[PDB]
């Protein structure tokens, strides 16, 4: 189907977010020519310097140039008055964060965790092939459909590695506008010294993620960002909280998914494995049933978007 | 050993010391972007000639250039209690001096010549088409980012043309007399400004290229009695295509020096140069011996405890 | 192991099939396979593998088989019958063609200086919504050499871009705005040259981008016409265009507009307008009826902006020109 680049079209109906620095409204949406339902991400640009221009029409090249199913697709882009309007498809149980604050408050279930990340590593491998670095891995830049597929989402943070038609080895770009992410970056992103950093900067997030849909709290919480960088400088590595770790102490994880954020979260970039690499992981062997059979059902406790 | 908090900024370590005062790494405490500090000490600058007048031209024109191959202004602060200024800049990692320093030879591959050559003059083509003359281009004021992207510097000797003037003529002689054109060392009236910019473009490519400089002498006096005779060499291990650029720029008369355009059209500045040597590395720290040149930061954040 | 003679054949003729599909999808898929397979045998010559860098013999015999064939002009025609990741190979693939060189010479550009058509069908791309990505990217890395600039801005086909730079699919409009702003600032000879050798028709367009509907399209052109204006290669422009009565009428509108961004960027272009000597009698006579007006106003435009320390020196010196102004 093909959406009208015209403001005429769309009936906003309720607001199920917020973003970029505080400038975006995320609404739902009703397409009045077929009825169905949409989301509408909108930022004045008035609010924009020149620069923040510019760093918006860099997210429209970028989710342009990937097709893959386990990224999201965008619909339309237009302007509207002084608005940016993007428009893409509903996701029914919105980001894997807005689960965690309404229904999984003390952490997710692992085979629940199990499906989301092999979803997300699928979609970092094509990502990595076409010469991008994602930043921003993190669990509101997950989604998630009424028929339990995951979408990862954060394309405005994306680096080309590509330079004069050469692949780099390295790149040394200081990710804009990334004052809400900086738990989620790798040392060798924040260190900005000589060494320079590549695609296995991903790998540290997703660590950092695994913790975050496991424990129900990002890592380094509580911390400002000062103290937050030096005890990444110092090597303090965040792990899961079970009995094997230590009121939620009941449970334990299996030592796949224990092994899994040990081979992530490695101090040396060289030492962490490929995307392609930990989809074979003995950690996503447990996955038996199909993703829109069991994620579901996974969710029971929750009520999707309809 | 303690930590210092400026605005937003908390302080690191020195990285070195200008014409007019000490160069520190800082942190921004809010984004944890990595920042260079000018610390301006207004006791100091009214011993200067002219100081204070330079300082304010400097912020402003740095508040109004932008370019990938010129240095960024990030905040000017104020302590009038304490009776200082500071300008925070965008962090370089060395000067292209400190690698000229740093080998027995004192020269760069031609095809590591080539690639700094390409963004000066990039550099210089916007300077130019904006109306700002920079009298004083040479090694020690060209930086070079982490990403190996250069940056030119120091911009507190240059002029700027008047909106409504047809051409670039300039009045007064100023900057570093080694990098100087004949039009200088004579002590004419009136000379062409962005011609005198090619001149030091010039003995920056010889130098970089060659590791000597083409006019010498004890003092000023002697350096500029050299140069207005106008005579020089080009050694024999320099190519004819080098040897060729190196005479249309360093010419005697402003009129027969080439212009960005008959430099861009150059034979060696057009040709590909093969990777033949291996290129100079920028130098380890020269206190730490570190390498990768990381942040001072860490026992100031060790000091102060977040925040 | 294939030759790049083998992978050009091969290319050719599964496009030479794609290009009719009289033949039912049985063929029409195995086609289609082999056009995305020796996409990629071409791309690995070029590119290379990490364990086997790219081998400059067999780069010369691809770049010389791809003028002998004509496949250059047939990749570019045929684009819409590629596949996504296909068409990504083939922008790829004339890209790094595009900068090969042979001491000084860049025969590529020798070779699209005669069939000019790949300028032009590259161009035309941003009418086809499915390929207009691809073409502006490939169209961006030819306007970077000068000969290729020329044929371009010399060309009845330039004023299209007035067409696309407003166009209601916002991704599609704003790379066309990219590949415009790059023609007019890249090359400064060429771009004086042109400018005004066509002054009379080029700000005939340009003034219907500064009514705009649009506020990205009035924002960004109205920008850039302060760049075009300030940049010294430019000045007899510049000289010209300030000594028009409809263009200082059109600025006194702009610093009235709902946008702060807006007047902020009229009161950069209208400065240049009172700060000129030698004006022209119908500016003096407009100032002069608008002297009051314009004293009141600029004593109060955007006094809460107190960071800015030149911008106080500038609205200073235009009070006091407006003061200073002289009755006939
Ligand atoms: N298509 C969508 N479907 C459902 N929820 C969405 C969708 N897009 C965004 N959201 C919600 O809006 C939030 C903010 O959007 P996000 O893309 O994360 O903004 P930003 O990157 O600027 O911070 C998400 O974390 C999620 O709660």
Same mark, same amino acid.
């Given at each position: 189907?093909?959406? +009208?680049?015209?403001?005429?079209?769309?009936?906003?109906?309720?607001?199920?977010?917020?973003?970029?620095?505080?400038?975006? &409204?995320?609404?739902?949406?009703?397409?009045?020519?077929?009825?169905? *339902?949409?989301?509408?991400?909108?930022?004045?640009?008035?609010?924009?310097?020149?620069?923040?221009?510019?760093?918006?029409?860099?997210?429209?090249?970028?989710? $342009?140039?990937?097709?893959?199913?386990?990224?999201?697709?965008?619909?339309? &882009?237009?302007?509207?008055?002084?608005?940016?309007?993007?428009?893409?498809?509903?996701?029914?149980?919105?980001?894997?964060?807005?689960?965690?604050?309404?229904?999984?408050?003390?952490?997710?279930?692992?085979?629940? /965790?199990?499906?989301?990340?092999?979803?997300?590593? $699928?979609?970092?491998?094509?990502?990595?092939?076409?010469?991008?670095?994602?930043?921003?891995?993190?669990?509101?830049?997950? +989604?998630?459909?009424?028929?339990?597929?995951?979408?990862?989402?954060? +394309?405005?943070?994306?680096?080309?590695?590509?330079?004069?038609?050469?692949?780099?080895?390295?790149?040394?770009?200081?990710?804009? *506008?990334?004052? $809400?992410?900086?738990?989620?970056?790798?040392?060798?992103?924040?260190?900005?010294?000589?060494?320079?950093?590549?695609? $296995?900067?991903?790998?540290?997030?997703?660590?950092?993620?695994?913790?975050? +849909?496991?424990?129900?709290?990002?890592?380094?919480?509580?911390?400002?960002?000062?103290?937050?960088?030096?005890?990444?400088?110092?090597?303090?590595?965040?792990?899961?909280?079970?009995?094997?770790? /230590?009121?939620? *102490?009941?449970?334990?994880?299996?030592?796949?998914?224990?092994?899994?954020?040990?081979?992530?979260?490695?101090?040396?970039?060289?030492?962490?494995?490929?995307?392609?690499?930990?989809?074979?992981?003995?950690?996503?062997?447990?996955?038996?049933?199909?993703?829109?059979?069991?994620?579901?059902?996974?969710?029971?406790?929750?009520?999707?978007?309809? | 050993?303690?930590?210092?908090?400026?605005?937003?900024? !908390?302080?690191?370590?020195?990285?070195?010391?200008?014409?007019?005062?000490?160069?520190?790494?800082?942190?921004?405490?809010?984004?944890?972007?990595?920042?260079?500090?000018?610390?301006?000490?207004?006791?100091?600058?009214?011993?200067?000639?002219?100081?204070?007048?330079?300082?304010?031209?400097?912020?402003?024109?740095?508040?109004?250039?932008?370019?990938?191959?010129?240095?960024? !202004?990030?905040?000017?602060?104020?302590?009038?209690?304490?009776?200082?200024?500071?300008?925070?800049?965008?962090?370089?990692?060395?000067?292209?001096?400190?690698?000229?320093?740093?080998?027995?030879?004192?020269?760069?591959?031609?095809?590591?010549?080539?690639?700094?050559?390409?963004?000066?003059?990039?550099?210089?083509?916007?300077?130019?088409?904006?109306?700002?003359?920079?009298?004083?281009?040479?090694?020690?004021?060209?930086?070079?980012?982490?990403?190996?992207?250069?940056?030119?510097?120091? !911009?507190?000797?240059?002029?700027?043309?008047?909106?409504?003037?047809?051409?670039?003529?300039?009045?007064?002689?100023?900057?570093?007399?080694?990098?100087?054109?004949?039009?200088?060392?004579?002590?004419?009236?009136?000379?062409?400004?962005?011609?005198?910019?090619?001149?030091?473009?010039?003995?920056?490519?010889?130098?970089?290229?060659?590791?000597?400089?083409?006019?010498?002498?004890?003092?000023?006096?002697?350096?500029?009695?050299?140069?207005?005779?106008?005579?020089?060499?080009?050694?024999?291990?320099?190519?004819?295509?080098?040897?060729?650029?190196?005479?249309?720029?360093?010419?005697?008369?402003?009129?027969?020096?080439?212009?960005?355009?008959?430099?861009?059209?150059?034979?060696?500045?057009?040709?590909?140069?093969?990777?033949?040597?291996?290129?100079?590395?920028?130098?380890?720290?020269?206190?730490?011996?570190?390498?990768?040149?990381?942040?001072?930061?860490?026992?100031?954040?060790?000091?102060?405890?977040?925040? | 192991?294939?030759?790049?003679?083998?992978?050009?054949?091969?290319?050719?003729?599964?496009?030479?099939?794609?290009?009719?599909?009289?033949?039912?999808?049985?063929?029409?898929?195995?086609?289609?396979?082999?056009?995305?397979?020796?996409?990629?045998?071409?791309?690995?010559?070029?590119?290379?593998?990490?364990?086997?860098?790219?081998?400059?013999?067999?780069?010369?015999?691809?770049?010389?088989?791809?003028?002998?064939?004509?496949?250059?002009?047939?990749?570019?025609?045929?684009?819409?019958?590629?596949?996504?990741?296909?068409?990504?190979?083939?922008?790829?693939?004339?890209?790094?063609?595009?900068?090969?060189?042979?001491?000084?010479?860049?025969?590529?550009?020798?070779?699209?200086?005669?069939?000019?058509?790949?300028?032009?069908?590259?161009?035309?791309?941003?009418?086809?919504?499915?390929?207009?990505?691809?073409?502006?990217?490939?169209?961006?890395?030819?306007?970077?050499?000068?000969?290729?600039?020329?044929?371009?801005?010399?060309?009845?086909?330039?004023?299209?871009?007035?067409?696309?730079?407003?166009?209601?699919?916002?991704?599609?409009?704003?790379?066309?705005?990219?590949?415009?702003?790059?023609?007019?600032? =890249?090359?400064?000879?060429?771009?004086?040259?042109?400018?005004?050798?066509?002054?009379?028709?080029?700000?005939?367009?340009?003034?219907?981008?500064?009514?705009?509907?649009?506020?990205?399209?009035?924002?960004?052109?109205?920008?850039?016409?302060?760049?075009?204006?300030?940049?010294?290669?430019?000045?007899?422009?510049?000289?010209?265009?300030?000594?028009?009565?409809?263009?200082?009428?059109?600025?006194?509108?702009?610093?009235?507009?709902?946008?702060?961004?807006?007047?902020?960027?009229?009161?950069?272009?209208?400065?240049?307008?009172?700060?000129?000597?030698?004006?022209?009698?119908?500016?003096?006579?407009?100032?002069?009826?608008?002297?009051?007006?314009?004293?009141?106003?600029?004593?109060?435009?955007?006094?809460?902006?107190?960071?800015?320390?030149?911008?106080?020196?500038?609205?200073?010196?235009?009070?006091?020109?407006? =003061?200073?102004?002289?009755?006939?």
């Amino acid at each position: 189907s093909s959406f +009208l680049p015209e403001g005429g079209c769309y009936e906003l109906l309720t607001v199920i977010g917020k973003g970029f620095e505080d400038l975006m &409204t995320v609404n739902l949406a009703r397409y009045k020519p077929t009825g169905e *339902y949409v989301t509408v991400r909108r930022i004045n640009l008035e609010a924009c310097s020149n620069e923040m221009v510019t760093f918006l029409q860099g997210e429209l090249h970028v989710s $342009k140039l990937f097709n893959h199913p386990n990224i999201v697709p965008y619909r339309a &882009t237009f302007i509207a008055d002084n608005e940016l309007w993007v428009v893409t498809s509903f996701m029914a149980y919105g980001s894997a964060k807005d689960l965690i604050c309404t229904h999984f408050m003390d952490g997710m279930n692992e085979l629940a /965790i199990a499906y989301i990340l092999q979803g997300v590593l $699928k979609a970092l491998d094509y990502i990595h092939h076409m010469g991008y670095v994602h930043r921003s891995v993190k669990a509101s830049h997950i +989604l998630i459909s009424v028929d339990g597929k995951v979408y990862l989402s954060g +394309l405005r943070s994306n680096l080309s590695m590509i330079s004069h038609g050469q692949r780099q080895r390295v790149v040394h770009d200081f990710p804009k *506008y990334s004052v $809400k992410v900086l738990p989620w970056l790798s040392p060798e992103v924040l260190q900005q010294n000589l060494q320079g950093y590549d695609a $296995k900067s991903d790998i540290y997030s997703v660590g950092i993620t695994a913790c975050e +849909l496991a424990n129900g709290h990002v890592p380094f919480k509580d911390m400002p960002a000062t103290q937050m960088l030096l005890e990444k400088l110092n090597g303090t590595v965040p792990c899961l909280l079970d009995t094997s770790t /230590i009121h939620p *102490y009941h449970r334990t994880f299996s030592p796949h998914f224990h092994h899994f954020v040990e081979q992530c979260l490695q101090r040396n970039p060289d030492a962490r494995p490929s995307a392609s690499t930990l989809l074979n992981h003995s950690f996503f062997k447990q996955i038996k049933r199909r993703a829109s059979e069991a994620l579901p059902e996974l969710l029971r406790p929750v009520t999707p978007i309809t | 050993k303690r930590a210092k908090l400026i605005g937003k900024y !908390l302080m690191g370590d020195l990285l070195g010391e200008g014409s007019y005062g000490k160069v520190k790494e800082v942190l921004d405490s809010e984004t944890l972007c990595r920042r260079a500090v000018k610390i301006l000490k207004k006791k100091k600058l009214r011993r200067i000639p002219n100081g204070e007048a330079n300082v304010k031209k400097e912020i402003q024109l740095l508040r109004r250039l932008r370019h990938k191959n010129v240095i960024q !202004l990030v905040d000017v602060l104020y302590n009038e209690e304490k009776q200082k200024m500071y300008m925070v800049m965008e962090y370089c990692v060395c000067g292209m001096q400190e690698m000229l320093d740093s080998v027995p030879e004192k020269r760069f591959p031609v095809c590591q010549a080539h690639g700094y050559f390409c963004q000066l003059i990039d550099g210089l083509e916007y300077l130019h088409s904006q109306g700002i003359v920079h009298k004083d281009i040479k090694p020690g004021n060209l930086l070079l980012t982490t990403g190996g992207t250069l940056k030119i510097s120091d !911009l507190g000797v240059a002029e700027a043309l008047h909106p409504f003037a047809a051409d670039d003529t300039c009045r007064t002689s100023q900057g570093s007399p080694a990098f100087q054109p004949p039009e200088i060392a004579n002590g004419l009236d009136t000379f062409s400004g962005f011609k005198v910019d090619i001149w030091s473009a010039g003995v920056t490519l010889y130098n970089i290229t060659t590791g000597l400089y083409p006019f010498e002498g004890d003092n000023i006096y002697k350096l500029f009695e050299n140069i207005g005779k106008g005579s020089y060499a080009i050694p024999g291990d320099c190519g004819p295509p080098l040897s060729d650029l190196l005479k249309g720029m360093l010419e005697y008369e402003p009129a027969k020096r080439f212009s960005i355009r008959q430099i861009r059209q150059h034979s060696w500045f057009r040709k590909k140069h093969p990777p033949a040597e291996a290129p100079v590395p920028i130098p380890p720290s020269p206190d730490t011996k570190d390498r990768w040149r990381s942040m001072t930061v860490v026992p100031y954040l060790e000091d102060l405890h977040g925040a | 192991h294939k030759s790049p003679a083998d992978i050009v054949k091969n290319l050719k003729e599964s496009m030479a099939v794609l290009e009719k599909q009289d033949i039912s999808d049985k063929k029409a898929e195995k086609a289609t396979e082999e056009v995305s397979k020796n996409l990629v045998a071409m791309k690995e010559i070029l590119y290379g593998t990490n364990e086997k860098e790219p081998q400059t013999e067999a780069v010369a015999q691809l770049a010389q088989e791809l003028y002998n064939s004509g496949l250059l002009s047939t990749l570019v025609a045929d684009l819409q019958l590629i596949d996504f990741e296909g068409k990504k190979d083939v922008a790829q693939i004339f890209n790094n063609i595009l900068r090969r060189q042979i001491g000084t010479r860049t025969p590529t550009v020798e070779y699209i200086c005669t069939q000019q058509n790949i300028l032009f069908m590259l161009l035309k791309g941003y009418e086809s919504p499915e390929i207009a990505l691809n073409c502006g990217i490939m169209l961006r890395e030819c306007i970077r050499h000068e000969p290729l600039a020329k044929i371009i801005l010399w060309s009845e086909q330039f004023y299209d871009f007035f067409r696309y730079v407003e166009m209601s699919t916002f991704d599609i409009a704003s790379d066309a705005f990219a590949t415009f702003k790059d023609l007019l600032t =890249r090359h400064k000879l060429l771009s004086a040259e042109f400018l005004e050798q066509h002054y009379d028709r080029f700000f005939s367009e340009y003034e219907k981008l500064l009514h705009s509907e649009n506020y990205v399209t009035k924002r960004q052109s109205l920008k850039l016409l302060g760049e075009l204006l300030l940049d010294r290669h430019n000045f007899t422009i510049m000289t010209k265009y300030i000594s028009k009565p409809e263009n200082l009428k059109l600025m006194m509108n702009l610093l009235r507009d709902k946008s702060r961004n807006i007047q902020f960027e009229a009161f950069h272009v209208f400065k240049v307008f009172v700060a000129n000597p030698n004006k022209t009698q119908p500016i003096l006579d407009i100032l002069l009826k608008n002297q009051a007006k314009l004293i009141e106003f600029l004593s109060k435009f955007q006094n809460d902006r107190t960071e800015d320390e030149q911008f106080n020196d500038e609205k200073t010196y235009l009070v006091k020109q407006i =003061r200073d102004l002289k009755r006939p």
